[PDB]
Symmetry: C2
C-alpha cells in the first residue's frame, strides 16, 4: 500500500490509546501529565510554533510497548499543540509485512515513525528511541524509561521536518 493508503487506515492517537489495557492507558496518562505539568523548553516550543505546513506522521506502534507509550505520548502532545502535525498509527505486524522492503529494514523496531509531507513524500524517520537516547548508555536509557527524554522525540521529529525543503 502507498503511504497515503497506510495513513488512511492508521488510527488516531485517542483511538489507539482507547484499545489498550487499563494498565497501558495509565502509562500513557503518566507521560502525558509530565508534559502537561513541566511543558517544553522555549527554544523547542518556538520551533514547533513555526511549523506552518502540514506534515503527516505514519506510525507503526502497539499500546503494550513501553517505547510507544513514551514517545507517542510526546508526539501526541506536540500534535495537539501544533495541529499542522497529524499521527496515524498502524500495527507492528503490518509494518513487518508492507514497510520492510521499501525502508530496507530486516526487522521492525517500534515505534517506527515515518515523517511525510503533504504529498506523502518521505522526509525521514524516528526509530524506537530519540537519537540522544540511542547514543547513550544505561544511564540515559534509564532516565528515558522514566520519561526524562520526552522532549527529545519531538525535537527529533521537528529536526527531520526542518532538515527538508
Amino acid at each position: 500500500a502507498s503511504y497515503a493508503e497506510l495513513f488512511d487506515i492508521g488510527e488516531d492517537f485517542a483511538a489507539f490509546v482507547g484499545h489498550g489495557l487499563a494498565t497501558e492507558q495509565g502509562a500513557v496518562a503518566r507521560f502525558r501529565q509530565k508534559l502537561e505539568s513541566n511543558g517544553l523548553p522555549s527554544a523547542l516550543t518556538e520551533r514547533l510554533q513555526r511549523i506552518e505546513r502540514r506534515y503527516r506522521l505514519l506510525v507503526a506502534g502497539e499500546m503494550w510497548c513501553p517505547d510507544c507509550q513514551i514517545n507517542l505520548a510526546a508526539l501526541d502532545f506536540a500534535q495537539r499543540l501544533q495541529p499542522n502535525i497529524e499521527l496515524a498509527i498502524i500495527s507492528k505486524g503490518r509494518a513487518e509485512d508492507d514497510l520492510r522492503q521499501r525502508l530496507a529494514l530486516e526487522r521492525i523496531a517500534i515505534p517506527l515513525v515515518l515523517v511525510l509531507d503533504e504529498e506523502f513524500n518521505l522526509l525521514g524517520r524516528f526509530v524506537e528511541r530519540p537519537q540522544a537516547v540511542l547514543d547513550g548508555g544505561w544511564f540515559d536509557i534509564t532516565a528515558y524509561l522514566w520519561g526524562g527524554h520526552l522532549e527529545h522525540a519531538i525535537g527529533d521529529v521537528l529536526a527531520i521536518i526542518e532538515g527538508a525543503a
Copy 2:
C-alpha cells in the same frame, strides 16, 4: 493480561475488517460471499445449532494476512449464524508479547484462535490453518487459498468446543 482482559480490548470482526485496506476488505467480502451462496453441510450446520452455551474466541490476527482473511471470514459466518459464539481480535504483536509463554509458543502464526468457555478457561486452539489443510500438501493448501476449506475452520472450532465438558 488475563484472557478476559485480552478479549475485552479485542475488536469485533466488523471493526477489524473496517480498519483494513480496500483490497483486504474485498478479499474478506469474497470469502463471505462463498459461504453466503454455498452455505454449509447439514451435518456441520446441525453441530453449530446445538451449541447452547456461550463460547469466546480470542483471536490474534491482522487484515493483511491471507489466512486471517480466509479463516476469520468463516468463523464470523458461524458466529453470525450462532451468536452464542463471539470473536474478539487482538494484534499479532500483542500475541507475541503476552501469549507466547503461557501457550508455550516460540513464534505466533496467525490467525491464532483460542477457544474459551464462559469462565474464560482455555478449551483448545486453532492455529493458522484447518487441520485437514495442515495435514495436506500443495494441492490442499491451494484449494484452501481459493476458499475451498472455509467450512473446516468452523468444524475445527466446533470440535474443540465439543471435545470439552
